[PDB]
Amino acid sequence: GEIAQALKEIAKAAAAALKEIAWALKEIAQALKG
Amino acid sequence: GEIAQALKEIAKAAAAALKEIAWALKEIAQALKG
Amino acid sequence: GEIAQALKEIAKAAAAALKEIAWALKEIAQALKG
Amino acid sequence: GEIAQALKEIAKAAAAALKEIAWALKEIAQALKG
Amino acid sequence: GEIAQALKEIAKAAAAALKEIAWALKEIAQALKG
Amino acid sequence: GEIAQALKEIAKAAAAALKEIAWALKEIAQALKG
Amino acid sequence: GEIAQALKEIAKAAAAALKEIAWALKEIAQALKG
Amino acid sequence: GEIAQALKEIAKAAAAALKEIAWALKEIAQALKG
Amino acid sequence: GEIAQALKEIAKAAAAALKEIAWALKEIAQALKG
Amino acid sequence: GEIAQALKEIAKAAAAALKEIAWALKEIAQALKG
Amino acid sequence: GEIAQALKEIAKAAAAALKEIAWALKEIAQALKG
Amino acid sequence: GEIAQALKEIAKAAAAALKEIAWALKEIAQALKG
Amino acid sequence: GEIAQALKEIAKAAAAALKEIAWALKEIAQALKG
Amino acid sequence: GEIAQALKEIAKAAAAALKEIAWALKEIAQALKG
Ligand SMILES: [N+]
Ligand SMILES: [N+]
Ligand code: NA
Ligand code: NA
Ligand code: NA
Ligand code: NA
């Protein structure tokens, strides 16, 4: 159904963008170690 | 449908804004490297 | 519809506030670079 | 309707709390300036 | 209704946890001030 | 109902994980203190 | 049902990604501790 | 809410029209009873 | 909830009007019995 | 909203067609009266 | 869930009242014998 | 949306079938006149 | 899903009861024929 | 979606059953002519 599919698009989009934040934070950690 | 369309707008707008956060965090990492 | 309108309000409000977070993170990067 | 009103409450509660985060990040930037 | 009540629970739980993030960020600012 | 229960799961899961973020931020504050 | 399942997927995907953020912040704390 | 109000409109319109059918059938009974 | 209450109103209104139809048909049967 | 509007269309269409049934029953009563 | 239970009530109430119509029609059939 | 469309299908299918009942009732009235 | 299943129960229950009405009308026809 | 499919099932089942009622009524008309 179109509603369920849109809800899955939220899951996917939100998760992917949150993981980008996590990767940027690892970059902060590497900068601090360097 | 309109509910599905609005849900997709949440996915798009939240993802885009979270990616702006990720980018600002990379700016912080770059400042910490020097 | 009213449910679709309220979902759009979530999209707008969340995106705007997340962008304020990104802008604040940029302020942190500026402070580190000064 | 009650579902739309609860969604609006999500929009309001989330936005207010995310702006609290933005403000705390401004406090970090201010701490770094000082 | 139960859907509305569950949405209000999202609002309440998310806002409270986001405020805990804001507080922890204030603790970072305070550590930097010291 | 199953939709209400799934919303409650969003509330519980999101709140728990956001609290994990708050705790990790407090560890950052502690590291800055020491 | 499919809407309930999609909502559970939001819960799981968001909680997992938020946990990755928390871990990355622990990594920053470790970097700051030396 | 708008969905609830539309459902109430189904209840009202359907009941009123079904009552018209019952009245018409009473007219039939009256015609048979001469 | 308001949607469930409106659906219950459909059930109640439709059943009561359908029973008026059944009653009018009984009246026809009795007119035909003489 | 489109769901409310569709529900209103059910109310209108069903009511109108049930009234056509009631009218046809009145025609039976008329035929029985000569 | 309360919406599902209300829909089941429509099913039950409408079916019971329609069966009352069927019984009344059988009474007409018996009167015509007859 | 698909739910709205399926609701419009109920309105259409129900109204058409109910009109067939009304025509069949007119055929009874006609038979009674002869 | 439970809502979809409840809607299917409406379809089944109403169709079966309406077919009982059709059968009783066939019994009226037979009584007239005899 | 499953909800839209179940609504379509109501449309189909209800139409088919109502047509059976129309056909039985025409049998009554024919019995009356005979
Ligand atoms: N801000
Ligand atoms: N027949
Ligand atoms: Na849908
Ligand atoms: Na500042
Ligand atoms: Na569903
Ligand atoms: Na750590």
Author numbering:
A (entry chain G), B (entry chain D), C (entry chain E), D (entry chain C), E (entry chain A), F (entry chain B), ...: 1 to 34
Show sentences the authors wrote.
De novo coiled coils (CCs) are particularly appealing modules for designing self-assembling systems as they are short, mutable, and sequence-to-structure relationships governing their folding and assembly are well established. For example, CC-Tri and CC-Tet exchanged with each other, as did the higher-order CCs, CC-Pent2, CC-Hex2, and CC-Hept. These two classes—i.e., CC-Tri plus CC-Tet, and CC-Pent2, CC-Hex2 plus CC-Hept—are structurally distinct: the trimer and tetramer have consolidated hydrophobic cores, whilst the others have central channels and are α-helical barrels. Similarly, peptides with Type II interfaces where the g, a, d, and e residues all engage in helix–helix interactions—namely the pentameric, hexameric, and heptameric α-helical barrels, CC-Pent2, CC-Hex2 and CC-Hept—also exchange with each other. To address this, using the insight from the data and analysis presented here, we have tested two different strategies for increasing specificity of coiled coils: (i) alternate placement of salt bridge-promoting residues, lysine and glutamate to discriminate the tetramer from the trimer; and (ii) incorporation of hendecad repeats to separate the α-helical barrels.
For the α-helical barrels, CC-Pent2, CC-Hex2, and CC-Hept, designing orthogonal variants was more challenging. Therefore, we took a different approach of incorporating non-heptad sequence repeats into these peptide sequences. Variations of this 3-4 spacing can lead to alternative CC sequences and structures. For instance, in 11-amino acid, hendecad repeats core-forming residues are spaced 3-4-4 apart at the a, d, and h sites of a → k repeats.16,63–67 Consequently, while heptad repeats drive association of left-handed CCs, hendecads lead to right-handed quaternary structures.16,63–67 We reasoned that replacing heptad with hendecad repeats at different locations in the pentamer, hexamer, and heptamer sequences should alter the hydrophobic seams and, in turn, might confer homo-specificity in the resulting sequences. Initially, we made several variants of CC-Pent2, CC-Hex2, and CC-Hept that extended the second heptads into hendecad repeats, with the new designs denoted by the suffix “-hen2”. In these, the original a-g sequences were maintained, and the new i-k sites were all made Ala. So, we tested Ala, Ile, and Leu in each of the three designs. Generally, for the CC-Pent2 and CC-Hept designs, these experiments revealed less exchange between the heptad and hendecad variants compared to the homotypic exchange of the parents, indicating that the strategy had increased orthogonality. To investigate this and test our hypothesis of altering the hydrophobic seams, we compared model and experimental structures of CC-Pent2-hen2, CC-Hex2-hen2, and CC-Hept-hen2 with Ala at the h position.
